[PDB]
Design a protein around this ligand. Sequence first.
Ligand SMILES: *[C@@H]1O[C@H](CO)[C@@H](O[C@@H]2O[C@H](CO)[C@@H](O[C@@H]3O[C@H](CO)[C@@H](O)[C@H](O)[C@H]3NC(C)=O)[C@H](O)[C@H]2NC(C)=O)[C@H](O)[C@H]1NC(C)=O
Ligand SMILES: *[C@@H]1O[C@H](CO)[C@@H](O[C@@H]2O[C@H](CO)[C@@H](O[C@@H]3O[C@H](CO)[C@@H](O)[C@H](O)[C@H]3NC(C)=O)[C@H](O)[C@H]2NC(C)=O)[C@H](O)[C@H]1NC(C)=O
Ligand SMILES: *[C@@H]1O[C@H](CO)[C@@H](O[C@@H]2O[C@H](CO)[C@@H](O[C@@H]3O[C@H](CO)[C@@H](O)[C@H](O)[C@H]3NC(C)=O)[C@H](O)[C@H]2NC(C)=O)[C@H](O)[C@H]1NC(C)=O
Ligand SMILES: *[C@@H]1O[C@H](CO)[C@@H](O)[C@H](O)[C@H]1NC(C)=O
Ligand SMILES: *[C@@H]1O[C@H](CO)[C@@H](O)[C@H](O)[C@H]1NC(C)=O
Ligand SMILES: *[C@@H]1O[C@H](CO)[C@@H](O)[C@H](O)[C@H]1NC(C)=O
Ligand SMILES: *[C@@H]1O[C@H](CO)[C@@H](O)[C@H](O)[C@H]1NC(C)=O
Ligand SMILES: *[C@@H]1O[C@H](CO)[C@@H](O)[C@H](O)[C@H]1NC(C)=O
Ligand SMILES: *[C@@H]1O[C@H](CO)[C@@H](O)[C@H](O)[C@H]1NC(C)=O
Ligand SMILES: *[C@@H]1O[C@H](CO)[C@@H](O)[C@H](O)[C@H]1NC(C)=O
Ligand SMILES: *[C@@H]1O[C@H](CO)[C@@H](O)[C@H](O)[C@H]1NC(C)=O
Ligand SMILES: *[C@@H]1O[C@H](CO)[C@@H](O)[C@H](O)[C@H]1NC(C)=O
Lengths: 465, 465, 465
Amino acid sequence: HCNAQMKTGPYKIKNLDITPPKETLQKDVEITIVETDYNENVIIGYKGYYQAYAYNGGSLDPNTRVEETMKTLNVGKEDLLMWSIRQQCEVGEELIDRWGSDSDDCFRDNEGRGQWVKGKELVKRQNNNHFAHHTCNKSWRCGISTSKMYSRLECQDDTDECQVYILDAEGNPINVTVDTVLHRDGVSMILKQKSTFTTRQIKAACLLIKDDKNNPESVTREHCLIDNDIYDLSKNTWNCKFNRCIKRKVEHRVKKRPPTWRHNVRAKYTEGDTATKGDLMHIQEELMYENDLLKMNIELMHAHINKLNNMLHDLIVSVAKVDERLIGNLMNNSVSSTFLSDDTFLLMPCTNPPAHTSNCYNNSIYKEGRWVANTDSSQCIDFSNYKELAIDDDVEFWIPTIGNTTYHDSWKDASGWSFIAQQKSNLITTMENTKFGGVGTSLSDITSMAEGELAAKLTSFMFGH
Amino acid sequence: HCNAQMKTGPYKIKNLDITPPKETLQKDVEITIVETDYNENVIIGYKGYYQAYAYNGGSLDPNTRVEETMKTLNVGKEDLLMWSIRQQCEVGEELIDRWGSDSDDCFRDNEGRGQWVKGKELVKRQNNNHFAHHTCNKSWRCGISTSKMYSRLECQDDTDECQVYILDAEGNPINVTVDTVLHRDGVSMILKQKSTFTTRQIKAACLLIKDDKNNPESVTREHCLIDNDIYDLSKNTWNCKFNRCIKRKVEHRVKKRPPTWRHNVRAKYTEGDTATKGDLMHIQEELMYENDLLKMNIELMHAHINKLNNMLHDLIVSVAKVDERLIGNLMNNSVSSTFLSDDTFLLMPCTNPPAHTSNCYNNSIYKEGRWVANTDSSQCIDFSNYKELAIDDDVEFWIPTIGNTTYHDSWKDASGWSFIAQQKSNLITTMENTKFGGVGTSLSDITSMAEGELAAKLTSFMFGH
Amino acid sequence: HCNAQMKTGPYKIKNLDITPPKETLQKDVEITIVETDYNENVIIGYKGYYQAYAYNGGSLDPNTRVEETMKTLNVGKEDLLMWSIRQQCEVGEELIDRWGSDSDDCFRDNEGRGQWVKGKELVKRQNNNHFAHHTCNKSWRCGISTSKMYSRLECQDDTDECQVYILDAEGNPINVTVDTVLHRDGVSMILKQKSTFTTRQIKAACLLIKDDKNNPESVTREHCLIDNDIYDLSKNTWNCKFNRCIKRKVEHRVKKRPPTWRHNVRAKYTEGDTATKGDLMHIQEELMYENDLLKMNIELMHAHINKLNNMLHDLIVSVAKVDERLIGNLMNNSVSSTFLSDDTFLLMPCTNPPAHTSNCYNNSIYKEGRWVANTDSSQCIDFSNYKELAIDDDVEFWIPTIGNTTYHDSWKDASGWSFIAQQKSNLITTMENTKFGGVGTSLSDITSMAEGELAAKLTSFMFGH
Ligand SMILES: *[C@@H]1O[C@H](CO)[C@@H](O[C@@H]2O[C@H](CO)[C@@H](O[C@@H]3O[C@H](CO)[C@@H](O)[C@H](O)[C@H]3NC(C)=O)[C@H](O)[C@H]2NC(C)=O)[C@H](O)[C@H]1NC(C)=O
Ligand SMILES: *[C@@H]1O[C@H](CO)[C@@H](O[C@@H]2O[C@H](CO)[C@@H](O[C@@H]3O[C@H](CO)[C@@H](O)[C@H](O)[C@H]3NC(C)=O)[C@H](O)[C@H]2NC(C)=O)[C@H](O)[C@H]1NC(C)=O
Ligand SMILES: *[C@@H]1O[C@H](CO)[C@@H](O[C@@H]2O[C@H](CO)[C@@H](O[C@@H]3O[C@H](CO)[C@@H](O)[C@H](O)[C@H]3NC(C)=O)[C@H](O)[C@H]2NC(C)=O)[C@H](O)[C@H]1NC(C)=O
Ligand SMILES: *[C@@H]1O[C@H](CO)[C@@H](O)[C@H](O)[C@H]1NC(C)=O
Ligand SMILES: *[C@@H]1O[C@H](CO)[C@@H](O)[C@H](O)[C@H]1NC(C)=O
Ligand SMILES: *[C@@H]1O[C@H](CO)[C@@H](O)[C@H](O)[C@H]1NC(C)=O
Ligand SMILES: *[C@@H]1O[C@H](CO)[C@@H](O)[C@H](O)[C@H]1NC(C)=O
Ligand SMILES: *[C@@H]1O[C@H](CO)[C@@H](O)[C@H](O)[C@H]1NC(C)=O
Ligand SMILES: *[C@@H]1O[C@H](CO)[C@@H](O)[C@H](O)[C@H]1NC(C)=O
Ligand SMILES: *[C@@H]1O[C@H](CO)[C@@H](O)[C@H](O)[C@H]1NC(C)=O
Ligand SMILES: *[C@@H]1O[C@H](CO)[C@@H](O)[C@H](O)[C@H]1NC(C)=O
Ligand SMILES: *[C@@H]1O[C@H](CO)[C@@H](O)[C@H](O)[C@H]1NC(C)=O
């Protein structure tokens, strides 16, 4: 068992340093690059409130009840623009435990005015212990943010004009009206300041590659390195993906590749002299030194790779404690692991169900990456065709369209570690308030005893008095 | 606070692209490769049921009780083969809340017949609120899958015959009878279609390496690259691990390595002519261009390494939120971290207990990667010798042997994130049903009040009536 | 649904093998390295106990209560040194459920003597069901460990003397008295055996690099590779960080770099002869073979990189199930993911709140990496300047200074997966003891019914008897 203390200190993580190889090539070829400018120019806002009305009006009576309603409101153009300018909400008043005898303030305000905040989350609470009167509570909601628009850039060859397209969820161009309000799924969105691009020139290093490697006197084409990929720029045409385009003009050329030297064939320019052994040895020594430099670069790269490998293994070993299926997944097997210490562990195998087109197996469901027993009759999804994406695909997820304005969700449908984070306080309260042990015993009967014996005792006392 | 919405979309992760280096070597050497064929040919099946019988026969009585039994059944040869052919179970009927007055169906079926399913998990429920009669519930279990057999391949040199061995858990050959039924630990397994192998030829690139690097006129031996390792194939003998074997025949040879060129020594073939400066400059230019190509490959590799490093750092930074011991483990230190935001965090140190041969420290136990207080007197394991394995060791975990047919487990012994996933619904039900707050007050006394005051009130009413 | 079984086996993880490139450079340059010796020489110890005193003295009375106290004790010099020698505690006796009629042992011992243990964690339990008498419980604490001291090494040039400095949390030298006792935050620390260093010689490979790459006849300086970085050692001065210092002496020199060979210029040593085509072809063949070796090293490095990339992608795919914000973080976006199977998943976007200097948004707090609703009025931290550190910065976290001896903490302030690990048993007990369902009904009223109806029934029975 370790110990926890009061000593701390603020910190931030800095990336590991990678030393570039020495003696880099010379960049002397100009490349034209066109890409869209970075600009959010999308506004998102929402607002809502929660209300509860209660009136025990005593007990053992039908005059008792606590009804609650949740509402979502739209946001106007002027309000949303003013919020974007001020980066704040304009929201109503908070009511907590208001006695209902002359205070029914939860019935006179429905828009929400007076208070400006940078963001607020509603909390719901119910308390109706005052029998002789009414009670009501009210809470409010805030939200304001910006996001970038899903876009794409394309250019033509015969005219050299470029245009920017606005894409939907599936990636298709669509008409969007600028400076207007759209409501869908309980949020309001506005688009403004249509996107623009820019052009610049970048120096790069290029060489000639042979198409056929094991055949001399073959066809060669130009290749250049831009960021992490080698592009074929033999042809002077636009070629690009997403929003970044590459072009090499005709006038900018590349140094020619000398042919192989052989006897019986004239060797380029003629310089009539007699060579000596010293020149050959000088050339040999220079080339050996160059090879030595290349070798040193090789060991540097190898050391970097080894360091990364060690770091990755330490990472996986540390992380495997929480996720018990990581080791099996990395082995392309189906086992689960439990740890006896920080170094040693055990293994335990599972089976694999037959292939299926859904996530339901006769009262079994797949959730949170695990198969568990299920009793919900209707919670099943039929598998359809899937798309595939990489980490660097530059995809956005906010689209200003029209649709249903009704919204509904539940706190029970929380993903991994979001449920725990959201319900930690409630779990702590439940655990502390209920003193778990061998004292609670009102669970051995049915709901009859709540009213039966109580009313019978009341009547017995009344006619015995 | 962010927001959750109704907008989604199916997706799949695609691996990052790694561009191979240009101008690859030429593969002109034939290599013989022998490996075992991929074939599951192992059958696994299981079946069980759960039964509960209850009879309150009123309350305040000994005539009330809810006894439950769990049983596990074996599977025959014909049944298991038919299941494997159909990929389905043959299981009995489900009984839910059957009044016991003329319905005692939980006493007439014990094999399980009528229903064919692809997989079913049993759910246990008890309800005995009907005092005047009996009640009983029943559930059932399904399971069918296949797995590969742990095997090993070895070959001899003097005859060139290869054989496949079947290995146990420790990795020792054992006799296994084909097409028979074995029962152990509540499951049934059948082995069929003994393993086979195949032979093929693969082209590869080979060179000669010097044994002593800083000594000219030294001994050299042949080396070839197959997948990610350089193998010494100077000798024409079989050498292999697990189930994949490598061989190079005598007739297939490798190009010779020219010796170093020096003066006073004849230089291989004689071509009597006079060299000129132009030839030397041509050779120099060609070799410089080759060096340029090699350099470009170097920068490409460096860029790939940098991209991987950035991705790994982003991964660890994102993951460190859940596991608070990751940063300390990666630093070879003993600290814990808490986050103030998505970028900044704090640190807090622990201590290290003295070395021990178990996982128990005087009412302290090590579970889920953490040291916690313990009250269970007997839960301790004495450490023994440990084996070590890599991710790519090709080990299996299903072995058809004989052993005890009794099986028992508990839902309390769940590993990390399996307990949470399995008990999420029950936790939600407990939290929602119990309205945590300052209302529950039946915990301030002992179990006496369940019967004492109730019976005393009953008697008081009886003699006061 | 898979299955869990009784079959297991101890194991340990072995790091993946990285084959170094063939034909490594020759190491012939001596380098002087000075670093501090590895030595813990810091002692940490602590001790405490927990006591509870209770006396129901019946019920319905003020004579009932359960008061508990927690105390922390200092450790003397002799006691801590003796513990360090024996690697054990010297702790008192455990009292469990002692009837108070002639047994008040929880009032006579306050130091803790008799028992020697290697480590013990206290468990707190309260039970006061014996009305006629008293009861009390007692528990105890243990702790002993060692850690290394935060230090730094510096050396001077004109004299070649090195010294070791002791650093505080911020990294500043401070006076520390050796062999003395310091108390702070409820722990005791002792420093002994002030640090020392050592000197050794290491062979390394060095070359000459040009300062200006695209200009012949430029200035060059010496560079050497030590572990994973290339250091400039052109000057014979000490240069070092943390505690490891590097030096190259004047007498140890590096081989000179030959100049470029050109016509009209004498080529180093003169050897008057006539070259032939055979010599040139021999040189060409040798250099081509060297280039082939370099290429093979290139493909080996590429294969290693590809293997690492595949392993990292498998790791992230497996881990993404628990942390639903990993995919969005790796994409530099703000989305959350839910999984339909082990391969396919969905996406769901959030918003981004405006920039702020704290972690509180009007009843919202940031904890465990998530934004959740908050009701605690005062739990907020104002952001200050942050430091940045790498994984390999060699920082320690135990400092023997003076300060407040009072300590206090709570089990509610647990970080990620520490709360779950510590409260798993209590959660299991709460879930099992409370049979969640539609039976608990004592929550529909207020705390009045605990005493009201009970006392009224008591009085009714008393005057009806
Ligand atoms: C990780 O494990 C996966 C699950 O075992 C492997 O996926 C299976 O690989 C099999 C062999 O490559 C393939 O199954 C069949 O194999 C036999 C070979 O004799 C042939 O019938 C077919 O080639 C192939 N498919 C069918 C329909 O028969 C499949 O690729 C796949 N089987 C599945 C999904 O059921 C992965 O290959 C493995 N990854 C590795 C080893 O790198
Ligand atoms: C990560 O941290 C580990 C825990 O501190 C280190 O493991 C310890 O390293 C020590 C130094 O290498 C070794 O302990 C003793 O060191 C002294 C040196 O003067 C010598 O006595 C011995 O070389 C060594 N062993 C003994 C029995 O004395 C051990 O290797 C180890 N100590 C333990 C396990 O108690 C790791 O080295 C460290 N990893 C790094 C720095 O890369
Ligand atoms: C990952 O996402 C981050 C959040 O979008 C990016 O951080 C933002 O990048 C912006 C563009 O580089 C920068 O914001 C402003 O951009 C405009 C450009 O026209 C200019 O005003 C400024 O260059 C820049 N800053 C200001 C004050 O305007 C910022 O770097 C940053 N914005 C923030 C933090 O609000 C990361 O760049 C992105 N990482 C990538 C793409 O690799
Ligand atoms: C957008 O509008 C233009 C003209 O208004 C039209 O030519 C184009 O087809 C529209 N894009 C669509 C419908 O995707
Ligand atoms: C399994 O589910 C199917 C749903 O189509 C149902 O028809 C079948 O009866 C179920 N099997 C049982 C309940 O044993
Ligand atoms: C969206 O669907 C809901 C059904 O719940 C309906 O009430 C609402 O009117 C719909 N809105 C639109 C714009 O179609
Ligand atoms: C398997 O059986 C063969 C012959 O039946 C025998 O030679 C061999 O030793 C057996 N393998 C064992 C016992 O591991
Ligand atoms: C610690 O455990 C050992 C078990 O051998 C026991 O003998 C000893 O009394 C324990 N120490 C206590 C209870 O303080
Ligand atoms: C296995 O052990 C159990 C003890 O729980 C015993 O009842 C059973 O008969 C044993 N089976 C065999 C095959 O030895
Ligand atoms: C430590 O003590 C020495 C002499 O006792 C003094 O010169 C030095 O400044 C001290 N270090 C500090 C105060 O950081
Ligand atoms: C938000 O918090 C601030 C704290 O300074 C407070 O003044 C303001 O009233 C709060 N907004 C509400 C309660 O709507
Ligand atoms: C530390 O602060 C506490 C306040 O909680 C005080 O009681 C104690 O005396 C202080 N100790 C020292 C050494 O200043």
